[PDB]
């Protein structure tokens, strides 16, 4: 195709090459630029004049081209690679305006599978002074990035008042998530207890907490 | 030793103008520079919006020309966006950028000037909303018996009920960076949204350490610092 292209995603085994390439009338004559980014981070410029690494990029990056395609590859992928990868053109059009390429998703396979660690806090005394309360059930380094999470007051469930959040992807690659029991002070005071339960591939870690 | 950061409103109301500045520094805005802005709507791609050198003349993305103007301030050494008649599309992470100077058209007397954008500030949040901004309550999560595991405590700050993102959080002023988790925020029903900072720290520092967590809601022009102490009582 005549736009700027590259897959949305490809996978890459830990220690081995990947190439991601981006295509489009654009490249020709062109010298292309490649930006690296992770979740909730600014893009990182990792190769610049289609082959040129910016101090500070390591060695395992390069950059090749050739009529309308231009390719970014990394050689021995480390855990850390993993990213999202545009390319970026000018085009030939007009006053040349500036294409970002729609980014390809590079997943690096072998990364270490994990549990969930799980604190779950019951509300502050300033909460519950406030006329609120609210449960906080914090989960994290867990892989892959795939959890159910439950609620109990003493032995029974609860589902009203509870939000829970979407997994996010940690800076190590293991992901998070949050989930809130919200109640009235009255109901977290006269309880025994409330419990937060963490559904992850098949195993369950549970925290309870108790008025004190 | 360029270095940008953008500042911006947080939220616009819809049909309203966005104004944006990226101050600069290490670096003055009258040397040879394309000082450019760059946009990510959430969870899709970038979208370049356009550049500025320092003598006036600008360059923008063809599909936001009627919209755009960005302008330089030698003196204060910053450069800045305008958008106008803004919409829901116009919600996006919207970066500042540098490039330096280039020359990438088949007439180019060179060809070794590329185009590319080297140094990048660090985002800032806009959203297009006509409902009405809403700073946080934020509470202390304190370490206890409970949320101690051998050697290791975890203690944090709960941010309630705000609108628009985001929420940052530092601890003892940037001082502790070690062990700080500052989870993504919960949209909740009410359409505010809600987060949590947590940091692990050794568990016999509970009593020598003090631990504040300082909760920034720029769109509120709020700022908090909580401190948080161990439960006793």
């Known amino acids: 195709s005549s736009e700027l292209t590259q897959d949305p995603a490809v996978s890459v085994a830990l220690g081995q090459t990947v190439r991601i390439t981006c295509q489009g009338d654009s490249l020709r004559g062109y010298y292309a630029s490649w930006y690296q980014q992770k979740p909730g981070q600014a893009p990182v410029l990792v190769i610049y004049?289609?082959?040129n690494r910016p101090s500070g990029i390591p060695d395992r990056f390069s950059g090749s081209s050739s009529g309308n395609t231009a390719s970014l590859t990394i050689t021995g992928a480390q855990a850390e690679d993993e990213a999202d990868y545009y390319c970026?053109?000018?085009?030939?059009?007009?006053?040349?305006?500036?294409?970002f390429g729609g980014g390809t998703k590079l997943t690096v396979l072998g990364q270490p599978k994990g549990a969930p660690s799980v604190t779950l806090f019951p509300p502050s005394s300033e909460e519950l002074q406030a006329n609120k309360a609210t449960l906080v059930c914090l989960i994290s380094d867990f892989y892959p990035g795939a959890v159910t999470v439950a609620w109990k007051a003493d032995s029974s469930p609860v589902k009203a008042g509870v939000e829970t959040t979407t997994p996010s992807k940690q800076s190590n690659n293991k992901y998070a998530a949050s989930s809130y029991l919200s109640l009235t002070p009255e109901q977290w005071k006269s309880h025994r207890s409330y419990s937060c339960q963490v559904t992850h591939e098949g195993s369950t870690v549970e925290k309870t907490v108790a008025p004190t | 030793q360029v270095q940008l950061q953008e500042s911006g409103p947080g939220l616009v109301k819809p049909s309203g103008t966005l104004s944006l500045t990226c101050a600069v520094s290490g670096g003055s805005i009258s040397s040879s520079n394309w000082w450019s802005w760059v946009r990510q709507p959430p969870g899709k791609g970038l979208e370049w919006i356009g550049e500025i050198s320092h003598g006036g003349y600008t360059n923008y993305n063809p599909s936001l020309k009627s919209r755009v103007t960005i302008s330089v301030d030698k003196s204060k050494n910053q450069f800045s966006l305008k958008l106008s008649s803004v919409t829901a599309a116009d919600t996006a992470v919207y970066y500042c950028?540098?490039?330096?100077?280039?020359?990438?058209?088949?007439?180019?007397?060179?060809?070794?000037?590329?185009?590319?954008?080297?140094?990048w500030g660090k985002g800032t949040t806009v959203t297009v909303s006509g409902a009405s901004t809403k700073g946080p309550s934020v509470f202390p999560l304190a370490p206890s018996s409970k949320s101690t595991s051998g050697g290791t405590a975890a203690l944090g700050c709960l941010v309630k009920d705000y609108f628009p993102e985001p929420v940052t959080v530092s601890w003892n002023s940037g001082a502790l960076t070690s062990g700080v988790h500052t989870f993504p925020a919960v949209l909740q029903s009410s359409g505010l949204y809600s987060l949590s900072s947590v940091v692990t720290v050794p568990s016999s520092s509970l009593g020598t350490q003090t631990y504040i967590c300082n909760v920034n809601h720029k769109p509120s022009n709020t700022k908090v610092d909580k401190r948080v102490e161990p439960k006793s009582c």
């Open positions: 004049g289609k082959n």
């Open positions: 950028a540098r490039a330096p100077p280039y020359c990438t058209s088949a007439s180019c007397p060179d060809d070794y000037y590329y185009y590319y954008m080297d140094v």
């Open positions: 970026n053109s000018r085009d030939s059009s007009g006053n040349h305006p500036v294409v």
